[PDB]
Structure 1
């Protein structure tokens, strides 16, 4: 009845944020405000194929009044490209959003199993110690030596006596701290060597023993 008009974007600006990276469990909303005569329809694709609400647990909400799609409680399987298609007898336009669902590790550093491995070596030989760490918030690594001041190895607070041997700081490198290297190992260099990895959430530690002979 009215002069035909191919679909167009009613609010381009509100569309520039192409990449949507959000932490898991959050709620994502993609909007493609458009118009045209006859009045255009709207449908969504996900990684190429049609996107029906049966494709994700709990489906999703579409509010055509706002040309939007809404997904509550994002999960890893929601990762992908989301494309809206606006179509009427006289045309088609589309926009594609990239949804990335990030999982966080709000935990203390996880230390690799095994490392640092215990040891008993021969004098004068140069011995290493590898400590490998997984941590979301940037971790900080420090190597310690289980001191034996007086006769006790356990201090007055039930915490084992130690001495800081190597600390991470600007320089070194994430990979230089990953290892504690000894020189002409002696006798007194006998004991337990501990790697301490700590982040803004907590601290984790692994030990290894080294006897001299």
Structure 2
């Protein structure tokens, strides 16, 4: 009859961890005679190389050491202690994340230059993966009395109201201009800020009258 030599230390099956970092799943036991330790992935025999990097479990320490973990490893791992007089088993659910310690990444082409009639109401978009809480802003490349670039060598701009709300896409980042006089013809920038530096794209808008050619 087998038993968990260390029960108290076995209620933590949730093991959320960062990628490429060795993991050690164990569950100490004993009995008469020494019971076997069976493993499995998701719920079926976990081969001693059942995956890349392979494993190296110490069937003696009642452990299952895995190195350089990967999201593809995230899977409720279960230990099985079977003995002639009894068979016990407990399961640990593993996960693996891959943090993106960068600035916000913004799909290209977005925003993208566009045109519109006066009094036309427009939008500009922005996809932004960004693990770290981003702080997206929409600038307007205004030109302070004379030049577009001030003594800081960096362009003059102005944060924009927001023009509306969420609505459309809960995955995008639009800016909605409305009566678009031949005054919003400047350049618009999407400045995605982040704990880890800033990222950003830009684009142009051009507005004309009502006939043409």
The alpha-carbon deviation at position 52 of structure 1 amounts to 2.4
Of 72, 77, 85 in structure 2, the residue corresponding to residue 82 of structure 1 is 77
Q: Which of the pair is proportionally richer in strand? A: 1
Hey, what's the Cα distance between the residues in 1 that align with 2:157 and 2:172?
18
Runs of at least 5 residues in structure 2 that lack an aligned partner in the other structure:
209-213
Residue in 1 that maps onto 2:122: 127
Alpha-carbon offset, residue 106 of structure 1? 0.7
Compute the TM-score of the two structures, normalised by the length of structure 2: 0.86
- Displacement of 1:128: 1.6
**Aligned residue in 2 for 1:141:** 136
The answer for unaligned runs of 5 or more in structure 1 is 1-5
Do structure 1's residue 180 and structure 2's residue 157 form an aligned pair? no
**Shift in Å at residue 99 of structure 1?**
0.9
Q: Does structure 2 conserve the Cα–Cα contact (< 8 Å) formed by 1:24 and 1:102?
A: yes
User: Which digits, 9 at most, give the CA deviation of each residue in 1:117-171, with x for residues without a partner?
Assistant: 212211112112222211101111110000122332233233122111147xxxx
TM-score normalised by structure 1 residue count: 0.86
Aligned to 1:3: none
* CA distance, structure 1, for counterparts of residue 42 and residue 147 of structure 2: 63
**Using the alignment, how far apart are the partners of 2:51 and 2:127 within structure 1?**
37
**CA distance change for structure 1 residues 74 and 177 in 2, over 3 Å: closer, same or farther?**
closer
RMSD: 2.1
Tell me the equivalent position of 1:63: 58
Superposed CA deviations along residues 44-65 of structure 1, whole A, max 9, x for unmatched, are: 1112222222223343333345
Q: Tell me whether 1:105 sits opposite 2:96 in the alignment.
A: no
- Once the two structures are overlaid, the 10-residue window that deviates more, 135-144 or 124-133, is 124-133
